[PDB]
Design a protein around this ligand. Structure first.
Ligand SMILES: [Cl-]
Ligand SMILES: [Cl-]
Ligand SMILES: [Cl-]
Ligand SMILES: [Cl-]
Ligand SMILES: [Cl-]
Ligand SMILES: [Cl-]
Ligand SMILES: [Cl-]
Ligand SMILES: [Cl-]
Ligand SMILES: [Fe+3]
Ligand SMILES: [Mg+2]
Lengths: 325, 60
């Protein structure tokens, strides 16, 4: 895969070897195929289809490597893992993997070794996925969602509590298959395989009420730290919920071309359109550090950052943007 | 107005520097000094970006 990266880079988390913030896509080079890219506050990891995990950036909380004397992984380097990796997620200063044996491991947050998180899971080969943001992780298998970490806004369960070290069952649909969990810094939205919202919890952004948003099928839900975005491909719209102090509400001016992909970082969004074949990638929201393009004033609207001959995959981090071809 | 509001009980106390901190979406941390908070300061600032947060306390 060909990977481009830009935005915040004070800890060399863009994998470019230098520590300068960048405002246009830069080729970042670890023939491995990228499964996905996950981002924490100041570290980045790339998982390839072969099961290898590579990372770069801050290691002062044990995000990437067991050597306490290693403060930062300056360039892309393999992450030592207990077994081949099938899925990965990051939190603020943490990295969590699902391995090929179906075991879940966490490092970071001051812990320098991968430690097993004992999630109740079946050994029947039902897909096991992990999602993470800020100080929470969830693990999904079948109809069940387990989670751990902060609970100060009742995102995992009620009543509030500072932190839950051991996994708790957040939701069991008792029926429909869960597709994924979209996570904000202190809230989450559970989506089924039909694109319907089945549950939501925590400090939900202003204007979003679970019971008013469970009607429509075929949605895609994305979350920034403090906002929810609902992409409706049938109508070619993105509906946003949040305060929008820094242009995070998706711009409502009519798009002339179909949206074929959406991703979010901490406080920005990344949009891909098909202009048929040519694909355009745009950013909206908070872009002080260059993660939305060269216009860094967080002005509203979609800012074009790249054009590609094939359909890209996009990923967002903490004021970082990733484009994978 | 401000980027967000954060509950004082959700911030992390750093006893070395005697300040409360909280992650910022830029990768750094918002900060409010203990002495400033004691005296009535209700805004935390980020050393790496222009975002600011209001610090609050809710009984609910
Ligand atoms: Cl591969
Ligand atoms: Cl272990
Ligand atoms: Cl357009
Ligand atoms: Cl600018
Ligand atoms: Cl533009
Ligand atoms: Cl504390
Ligand atoms: Cl925190
Ligand atoms: Cl602000
Ligand atoms: Fe900041
Ligand atoms: Mg409940």
């Amino acid at each position: 895969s060909c990977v481009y990266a830009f935005g915040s880079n004070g800890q060399r988390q863009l994998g470019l070897g230098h520590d300068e913030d960048m405002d246009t896509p830069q080729r970042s080079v670890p023939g491995a195929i990228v499964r996905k890219i996950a981002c924490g506050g100041n570290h980045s990891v790339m998982l390839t289809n072969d099961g290898n995990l590579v990372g770069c950036g801050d290691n002062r909380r044990g995000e990437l490597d067991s050597a306490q004397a290693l403060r930062q992984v300056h360039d892309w380097r393999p992450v030592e893992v207990p077994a081949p990796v099938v899925d990965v997620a990051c939190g603020w200063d943490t990295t969590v993997i699902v391995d090929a044996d179906g075991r879940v491991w966490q490092r970071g947050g001051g812990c320098y070794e991968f430690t097993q998180q004992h999630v109740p899971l079946n050994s029947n080969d039902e897909r096991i996925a992990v999602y993470g943001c800020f100080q929470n992780f969830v693990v999904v298998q079948g109809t069940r969602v387990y989670g751990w970490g902060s609970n100060t806004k009742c995102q995992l369960q009620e009543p509030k509590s500072r932190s839950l070290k051991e996994p708790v069952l957040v939701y069991d649909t008792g029926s429909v298959a869960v597709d994924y969990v979209a996570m904000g810094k202190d809230f989450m939205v559970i989506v089924d395989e039909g694109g319907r919202i089945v549950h939501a919890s925590g400090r939900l952004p202003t204007g979003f009420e679970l019971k008013q948003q469970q009607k429509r099928h075929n949605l895609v839900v994305l979350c920034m730290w403090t906002s929810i975005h609902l992409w409706n491909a049938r109508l070619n719209t993105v509906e946003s919920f949040g305060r929008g102090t820094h242009s995070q509400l998706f711009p409502q001016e009519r798009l002339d071309f179909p949206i074929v992909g959406v991703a979010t970082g901490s406080e920005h969004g990344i949009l891909t359109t098909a202009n048929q074949h040519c694909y355009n990638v745009y950013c909206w929201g908070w872009g002080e550090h260059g993660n939305c393009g060269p216009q860094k004033g967080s002005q509203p609207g979609l800012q074009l950052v790249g054009q590609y001959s094939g359909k890209p995959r996009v990923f967002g981090g903490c004021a970082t943007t990733w484009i994978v071809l | 107005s401000t980027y967000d509001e954060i509950e004082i009980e959700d911030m992390t106390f750093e006893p070395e520097n005697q300040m409360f901190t909280y992650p910022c979406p830029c990768g750094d941390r918002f900060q409010i000094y203990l002495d400033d908070m004691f005296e009535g300061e209700k805004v935390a600032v980020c050393p790496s970006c222009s975002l600011m947060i209001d610090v609050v306390h809710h009984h609910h």
